[PDB]
Amino acid sequence: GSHMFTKHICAICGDRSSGKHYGVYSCEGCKGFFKRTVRKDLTYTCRDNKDCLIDKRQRNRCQYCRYQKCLAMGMKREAVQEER
Amino acid sequence: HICAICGDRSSGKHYGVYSCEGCKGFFKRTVRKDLTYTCRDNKDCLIDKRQRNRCQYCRYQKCLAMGMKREAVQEE
DNA sequence: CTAGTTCAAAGTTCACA
DNA sequence: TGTGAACTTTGAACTAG
Ligand SMILES: [Zn+2]
Ligand SMILES: [Zn+2]
Ligand SMILES: [Zn+2]
Ligand SMILES: [Zn+2]
Secondary structure (H helix, E strand, O other): OOOOOOOOEOOOOOOEOOEEEOOEEEOHHHHHHHHHHHHOOOOOOOOOOOOOOOOOOOHHHOHHHHHHHHHHOOOOHHHOOOOO | OEOOOOOOEOOEEEOOEEEOHHHHHHHHHHHHOOOOOOOOOOOOOOOOOOOOOOOHHHHHHHHHHOOOOHHHOOOO
């Protein structure tokens, strides 16, 4: 055999996870995206058909689909706090 | 028991006052590092569970007004 | 006597076509 | 523009005895 060092991946985009953010294992990108969205109650529109692939290379291509994938994966809006 | 500073659930007496783990930690740190804050608004920010972290000056002042004593916190 | 600590998960910044 | 890597506080859980 061989020794295993624990790696977590983003449940939104499959990128390497910096830990759990807002209730789910996510990267710094998806954490920041979700924060900014929730902070100003931003709403987006999918230019395609609400089924855009959300991965490291595609995540920035559709804010709508990225946001719905955050919620579908269990990211909690109530875990986003007020400004400091 | 409720936290006399923010109204959250109190974990018991801390530095003379019934407070939450948040106000304990925040008061401990403020004293240790001898921190000075400045209010962003008008020295009368509402301090409660959801708003406690919005202004450190008004929280520290509510910590003193509710009776927290600096001399209770360990120095170095 | 009536205190102490840790560190994940909250926060915020700022370089870049 | 809006992103995300790299940073600063916070507070739930727990410590010694
Ligand atoms: Zn991600
Ligand atoms: Zn889409
Ligand atoms: Zn409190
Ligand atoms: Zn204030």
